[PDB]
Scaffold this active site. Structure first.
Site, PDB file in Angstrom:
ATOM      1  N   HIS A   1      -5.292  -5.347  -7.813  1.00  0.00           N
ATOM      2  CA  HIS A   1      -6.176  -4.286  -7.350  1.00  0.00           C
ATOM      3  C   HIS A   1      -7.603  -4.836  -7.241  1.00  0.00           C
ATOM      4  O   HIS A   1      -8.086  -5.501  -8.161  1.00  0.00           O
ATOM      5  CB  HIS A   1      -6.120  -3.078  -8.295  1.00  0.00           C
ATOM      6  CG  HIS A   1      -6.984  -1.929  -7.862  1.00  0.00           C
ATOM      7  ND1 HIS A   1      -6.596  -1.030  -6.897  1.00  0.00           N
ATOM      8  CD2 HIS A   1      -8.230  -1.555  -8.246  1.00  0.00           C
ATOM      9  CE1 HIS A   1      -7.556  -0.135  -6.713  1.00  0.00           C
ATOM     10  NE2 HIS A   1      -8.563  -0.438  -7.514  1.00  0.00           N
TER      11      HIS A   1
ATOM     12  N   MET B   1       0.818  -1.209   0.000  1.00  0.00           N
ATOM     13  CA  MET B   1       0.000   0.000   0.000  1.00  0.00           C
ATOM     14  C   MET B   1       0.853   1.261   0.000  1.00  0.00           C
ATOM     15  O   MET B   1       0.706   2.122   0.865  1.00  0.00           O
ATOM     16  CB  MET B   1      -0.957  -0.006   1.202  1.00  0.00           C
ATOM     17  CG  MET B   1      -1.942  -1.185   1.195  1.00  0.00           C
ATOM     18  SD  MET B   1      -3.007  -1.236  -0.269  1.00  0.00           S
ATOM     19  CE  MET B   1      -4.104   0.148   0.076  1.00  0.00           C
ATOM     20  N   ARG B   2       1.754   1.355  -0.977  1.00  0.00           N
ATOM     21  CA  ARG B   2       2.517   2.576  -1.207  1.00  0.00           C
ATOM     22  C   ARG B   2       2.580   2.904  -2.691  1.00  0.00           C
ATOM     23  O   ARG B   2       2.624   2.010  -3.531  1.00  0.00           O
ATOM     24  CB  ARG B   2       3.935   2.456  -0.656  1.00  0.00           C
ATOM     25  CG  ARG B   2       4.027   2.591   0.834  1.00  0.00           C
ATOM     26  CD  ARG B   2       5.476   2.578   1.255  1.00  0.00           C
ATOM     27  NE  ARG B   2       6.223   3.635   0.583  1.00  0.00           N
ATOM     28  CZ  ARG B   2       6.493   4.816   1.123  1.00  0.00           C
ATOM     29  NH1 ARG B   2       6.088   5.088   2.358  1.00  0.00           N
ATOM     30  NH2 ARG B   2       7.176   5.715   0.430  1.00  0.00           N
TER      31      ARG B   2
ATOM     32  N   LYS C   1     -11.250 -11.470  -2.611  1.00  0.00           N
ATOM     33  CA  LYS C   1      -9.955 -12.107  -2.371  1.00  0.00           C
ATOM     34  C   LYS C   1      -9.879 -13.527  -2.946  1.00  0.00           C
ATOM     35  O   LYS C   1      -8.820 -13.947  -3.404  1.00  0.00           O
ATOM     36  CB  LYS C   1      -9.628 -12.129  -0.876  1.00  0.00           C
ATOM     37  CG  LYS C   1      -8.931 -10.861  -0.411  1.00  0.00           C
ATOM     38  CD  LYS C   1      -8.453 -10.958   1.033  1.00  0.00           C
ATOM     39  CE  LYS C   1      -7.795  -9.642   1.502  1.00  0.00           C
ATOM     40  NZ  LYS C   1      -7.235  -9.745   2.898  1.00  0.00           N
ATOM     41  N   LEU C   2     -10.986 -14.265  -2.943  1.00  0.00           N
ATOM     42  CA  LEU C   2     -10.965 -15.606  -3.539  1.00  0.00           C
ATOM     43  C   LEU C   2     -10.638 -15.518  -5.032  1.00  0.00           C
ATOM     44  O   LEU C   2      -9.957 -16.381  -5.585  1.00  0.00           O
ATOM     45  CB  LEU C   2     -12.296 -16.337  -3.329  1.00  0.00           C
ATOM     46  CG  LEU C   2     -12.700 -16.628  -1.876  1.00  0.00           C
ATOM     47  CD1 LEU C   2     -14.073 -17.288  -1.827  1.00  0.00           C
ATOM     48  CD2 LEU C   2     -11.663 -17.483  -1.155  1.00  0.00           C
TER      49      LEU C   2
ATOM     50  N   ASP D   1       1.343   6.396 -13.513  1.00  0.00           N
ATOM     51  CA  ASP D   1       0.004   6.741 -13.041  1.00  0.00           C
ATOM     52  C   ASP D   1      -0.648   5.543 -12.347  1.00  0.00           C
ATOM     53  O   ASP D   1      -0.740   4.451 -12.914  1.00  0.00           O
ATOM     54  CB  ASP D   1      -0.873   7.234 -14.195  1.00  0.00           C
ATOM     55  CG  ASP D   1      -0.573   8.672 -14.581  1.00  0.00           C
ATOM     56  OD1 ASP D   1      -0.154   9.452 -13.700  1.00  0.00           O
ATOM     57  OD2 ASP D   1      -0.756   9.021 -15.765  1.00  0.00           O
TER      58      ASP D   1
HETATM   59  N1  LIG Z   1       3.511   4.454  -9.318  1.00  0.00           N
HETATM   60  C1  LIG Z   1       2.566   3.456  -8.931  1.00  0.00           C
HETATM   61  N2  LIG Z   1       1.715   2.954  -9.840  1.00  0.00           N
HETATM   62  C2  LIG Z   1       0.802   2.013  -9.526  1.00  0.00           C
HETATM   63  O1  LIG Z   1      -0.046   1.550 -10.513  1.00  0.00           O
HETATM   64  C3  LIG Z   1       0.752   1.542  -8.207  1.00  0.00           C
HETATM   65  C4  LIG Z   1      -0.011   0.608  -7.491  1.00  0.00           C
HETATM   66  C5  LIG Z   1       0.459   0.632  -6.171  1.00  0.00           C
HETATM   67  C6  LIG Z   1      -0.058  -0.181  -5.031  1.00  0.00           C
HETATM   68  C7  LIG Z   1      -0.777   0.683  -4.033  1.00  0.00           C
HETATM   69  C8  LIG Z   1      -1.903   1.455  -4.652  1.00  0.00           C
HETATM   70  C9  LIG Z   1      -2.944   1.827  -3.632  1.00  0.00           C
HETATM   71  C10 LIG Z   1      -2.553   3.091  -2.940  1.00  0.00           C
HETATM   72  C11 LIG Z   1      -2.926   4.394  -3.307  1.00  0.00           C
HETATM   73  C12 LIG Z   1      -2.368   5.385  -2.434  1.00  0.00           C
HETATM   74  C13 LIG Z   1      -1.571   4.885  -1.386  1.00  0.00           C
HETATM   75  C14 LIG Z   1      -0.835   5.660  -0.339  1.00  0.00           C
HETATM   76  O2  LIG Z   1      -0.907   6.879  -0.332  1.00  0.00           O
HETATM   77  N3  LIG Z   1      -0.012   4.974   0.617  1.00  0.00           N
HETATM   78  C15 LIG Z   1       0.745   5.671   1.615  1.00  0.00           C
HETATM   79  C16 LIG Z   1       1.153   4.714   2.690  1.00  0.00           C
HETATM   80  C17 LIG Z   1       0.772   5.225   4.040  1.00  0.00           C
HETATM   81  C18 LIG Z   1       0.459   4.092   4.966  1.00  0.00           C
HETATM   82  O3  LIG Z   1      -0.653   3.506   4.893  1.00  0.00           O
HETATM   83  O4  LIG Z   1       1.295   3.720   5.831  1.00  0.00           O
HETATM   84  C19 LIG Z   1       1.972   6.247   0.965  1.00  0.00           C
HETATM   85  O5  LIG Z   1       2.262   5.970  -0.235  1.00  0.00           O
HETATM   86  O6  LIG Z   1       2.734   7.017   1.611  1.00  0.00           O
HETATM   87  S1  LIG Z   1      -1.574   3.220  -1.575  1.00  0.00           S
HETATM   88  N4  LIG Z   1       1.455   1.524  -6.095  1.00  0.00           N
HETATM   89  C20 LIG Z   1       1.654   2.089  -7.282  1.00  0.00           C
HETATM   90  N5  LIG Z   1       2.534   3.027  -7.665  1.00  0.00           N
HETATM   91  N1  LIG Z   2      -4.668  -0.783  -4.256  1.00  0.00           N
HETATM   92  C1  LIG Z   2      -4.093  -1.961  -3.645  1.00  0.00           C
HETATM   93  C2  LIG Z   2      -5.098  -2.757  -2.833  1.00  0.00           C
HETATM   94  O1  LIG Z   2      -6.154  -2.276  -2.401  1.00  0.00           O
HETATM   95  N2  LIG Z   2      -4.726  -4.017  -2.622  1.00  0.00           N
HETATM   96  C3  LIG Z   2      -5.586  -4.964  -1.950  1.00  0.00           C
HETATM   97  O2  LIG Z   2      -5.193  -5.164  -0.590  1.00  0.00           O
HETATM   98  C4  LIG Z   2      -5.500  -6.507  -0.185  1.00  0.00           C
HETATM   99  C5  LIG Z   2      -4.282  -7.168   0.448  1.00  0.00           C
HETATM  100  O3  LIG Z   2      -4.624  -8.426   1.037  1.00  0.00           O
HETATM  101  P1  LIG Z   2      -3.471  -9.499   1.423  1.00  0.00           P
HETATM  102  O4  LIG Z   2      -2.453  -8.748   2.277  1.00  0.00           O
HETATM  103  O5  LIG Z   2      -4.221 -10.558   2.205  1.00  0.00           O
HETATM  104  O6  LIG Z   2      -2.923  -9.926   0.072  1.00  0.00           O
HETATM  105  C6  LIG Z   2      -5.932  -7.243  -1.445  1.00  0.00           C
HETATM  106  O7  LIG Z   2      -7.356  -7.325  -1.442  1.00  0.00           O
HETATM  107  C7  LIG Z   2      -5.481  -6.342  -2.581  1.00  0.00           C
HETATM  108  O8  LIG Z   2      -6.285  -6.450  -3.767  1.00  0.00           O
END
Ligand SMILES: Nc1nc(=O)c2cc(CCCCc3ccc(C(=O)N[C@@H](CCC(=O)O)C(=O)O)s3)[nH]c2[nH]1
Ligand SMILES: NCC(=O)N[C@@H]1O[C@H](COP(=O)([O-])[O-])[C@@H](O)[C@H]1O
Length: 201
Positions: free
Chosen positions: A108, A89-90, A170-171, A142
């Site tokens: 996703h 989640m970054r 998730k399944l 993006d």
């Molecule tokens: N360049 C890029 N392209 C993608 O297609 C992609 C998918 C992910 C996968 C993640 C996409 C979903 C997310 C959206 C916004 C998030 C966020 O702001 N996370 C924080 C973390 C803070 C925390 O919870 O501790 C951060 O970045 O600082 S996480 N990361 C990607 N990065």
């Molecule tokens: N944008 C990213 C996002 O929302 N990812 C989602 O986080 C969960 C992680 O579960 P897991 O830690 O059990 O794999 C999953 O549902 C994945 O699709």
């Protein structure tokens, strides 16, 4: 193909990838698991599976680029070919994304291009769709805009919450993420010159 899996929590998608890559015909092997959060259950899963783990926290780095460089260092150490984002989640920085262009996959929990971002299930429920799903795509700069590899639709039930809907989705995730990793690792699917998905076979 040598794979790194990046996580931030529970790691159910990681476990599905571990299971699939140990099938005899798997073209992928998971050589390293990287987390940005300490003491999460996904680390236990990796450790139990005999896979090495590394934790990288944001608090030890100035900006997003130096954070990603620390990731990249480990990737290079383990001679990684493919990166899977599995509940990671970054947001990754531009140059890091560019370096791994065509080599990094994300799962996703929506049918992209609907409901991009960190709270897809909340969005899907708020909007009132009766069909949602999950998407594996190549990571582009993006967020959630990269080329789509596989998707699977999942119904929304009346009275669904984030808890019940995410369980159902998730399944499906645990099906298409291993299938997508295998397509990319076997060279069956690639990002291709014009950017759009190319099925080489
Ligand atoms: N360049 C890029 N392209 C993608 O297609 C992609 C998918 C992910 C996968 C993640 C996409 C979903 C997310 C959206 C916004 C998030 C966020 O702001 N996370 C924080 C973390 C803070 C925390 O919870 O501790 C951060 O970045 O600082 S996480 N990361 C990607 N990065
Ligand atoms: N944008 C990213 C996002 O929302 N990812 C989602 O986080 C969960 C992680 O579960 P897991 O830690 O059990 O794999 C999953 O549902 C994945 O699709």
């Amino acid at each position: 193909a040598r794979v790194a899996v990046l996580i931030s929590g529970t790691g159910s998608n990681l476990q599905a990838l571990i299971d699939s890559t140990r099938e005899p015909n798997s073209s992928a092997q998971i050589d390293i698991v990287i987390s940005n959060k300490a003491a999460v259950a996904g680390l236990d899963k990796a450790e139990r599976a005999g896979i090495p783990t590394r934790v990288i926290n944001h608090k030890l780095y100035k900006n997003r680029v130096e954070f990603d460089s620390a990731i990249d260092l480990v990737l290079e150490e383990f001679s990684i070919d493919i990166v899977c984002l599995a509940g990671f989640m970054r947001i990754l920085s531009g140059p890091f994304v560019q370096k791994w262009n065509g080599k990094m996959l994300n799962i996703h929990p929506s049918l992209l291009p609907s409901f991009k971002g960190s709270n897809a299930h909340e969005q899907a429920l708020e909007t009132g769709v009766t069909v949602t799903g999950c998407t594996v795509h190549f990571v582009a700069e993006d967020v959630d805009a990269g080329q789509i590899i596989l998707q699977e639709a999942v119904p929304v039930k009346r009275g669904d919450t984030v808890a019940t809907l995410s369980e159902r989705v998730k399944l499906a995730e645990h099906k298409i993420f291993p299938a997508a990793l295998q397509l990319v690792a076997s060279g069956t699917v690639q990002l291709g010159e014009n950017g759009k998905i190319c099925w080489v076979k």
